[PDB]
Amino acid sequence: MPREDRATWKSNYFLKIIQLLDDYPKCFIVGADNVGSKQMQQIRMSLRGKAVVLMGKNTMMRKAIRGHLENNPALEKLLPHIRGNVGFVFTKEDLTEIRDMLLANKVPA
Amino acid sequence: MKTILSNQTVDIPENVDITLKGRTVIVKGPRGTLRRDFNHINVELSLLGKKKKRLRVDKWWGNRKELATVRTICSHVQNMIKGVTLGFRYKMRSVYAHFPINVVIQENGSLVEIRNFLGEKYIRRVRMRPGVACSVSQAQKDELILEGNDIELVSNSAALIQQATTVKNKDIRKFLDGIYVSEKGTVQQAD
């Protein structure tokens, strides 16, 4: 809130996003309408092991990875990005099986 | 601070066809035609677009009051375009205590005649506006629906009804009786 404070306000999310920036290929673009019930733990618990799911404000994330990129690629997740409640489980695992488990595995399952 | 050229953007849909002869605006649509006179307002009116029908409302210089004025033309043109497509519909549930209220439409939808109104003997004959119809609606207890084109005329009629039903010399936190506007909407639904 004074920018970074070295506390958990603003530039700790802009430490986590930009320090969990050098461990992955494949942001996955999970989005749910409401998570107010135990759906939060239904997001994390079933996908644990590799449990991530971290993205704050998409308004925060406009010029964020642009200005603190130094990663060239993966900025082609551009303006198709902002819109929609997106949670971003950026992963490092095998193929589409992640999305397959989520193709339903939190809200009715 | 003597600003410059504030401009409002009024989209026009495909069905309605607009035509202005000055500050007098004449709009045609499926549900009749309509017109107003914006003579006393002194604002540039102009339209642009071959069959896209964009309207811009533009006022130069001015004051802060006149920058407040330039949005009101936009909002009235919006309401006229909503009316000439759809038309406005006011749904009024009559709220009655131990006494009922009888409401009849006396002649041709225009005249509304209210009776028995807390046991008052005085028959209350209220004359509505030209260009608006009134009907006692079906499938609902004492709901009264006013339908018309010009929203000023229709809502002036609704105000005339609710100020015809007004309780004198009592508490008005008790004696909650009258005919009140419950819902504002369109003639054709889902639009």
Binding site: - | K2, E44, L45, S46
Partner: protein, 139 residues
């Protein structure tokens, strides 16, 4: 409506003041009420004049914003404002008003004799044509 609004580089006439009858070109607007004008060939030096002083007309140019006398003169000569100015009815009206002020008595004598001859020819041919219109509408 409002066909002619001011701009960077629109020519203008100066009606009342120390420069009556002289074209200027508008360089830029200072603040709402005066503006900097300049005339390269119409003999008027770069200065700030009010808007109610100046009279607007319809020719424009292409200036950079706040250019020099040089580029104003270049666009002036390349657009040929003076000849095209004299070839409009507005300047014909101004020219006629100046000639009417600069008449003399012998000129007014010739004007009245030509005026009588013209109005007599008009009167005869108008009376004949409206008599012929009556004779046309008579059947």
């Amino acid at each position: 409506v409002f066909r002619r609004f001011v701009e960077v580089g629109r020519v203008a006439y100066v009606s009342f003041g120390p420069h009556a009858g002289k074209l200027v070109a508008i360089v830029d607007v200072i603040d709402q009420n005066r503006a900097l004008v300049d005339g390269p060939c119409t003999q008027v030096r770069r200065q700030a004049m009010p808007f109610k002083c100046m009279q607007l007309t319809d020719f424009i140019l292409k200036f950079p914003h706040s250019a020099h006398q040089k580029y104003v003169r270049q666009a002036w000569q390349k657009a040929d404002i003076n000849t095209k100015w004299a070839a409009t009815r507005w300047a014909k009206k101004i020219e006629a008003r100046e000639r009417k002020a600069k008449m003399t008595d012998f000129d007014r004598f010739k004007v009245m004799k030509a005026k009588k001859m013209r109005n007599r020819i008009i009167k005869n041919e108008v009376k004949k044509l409206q008599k012929a219109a009556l004779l046309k509408a008579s059947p």
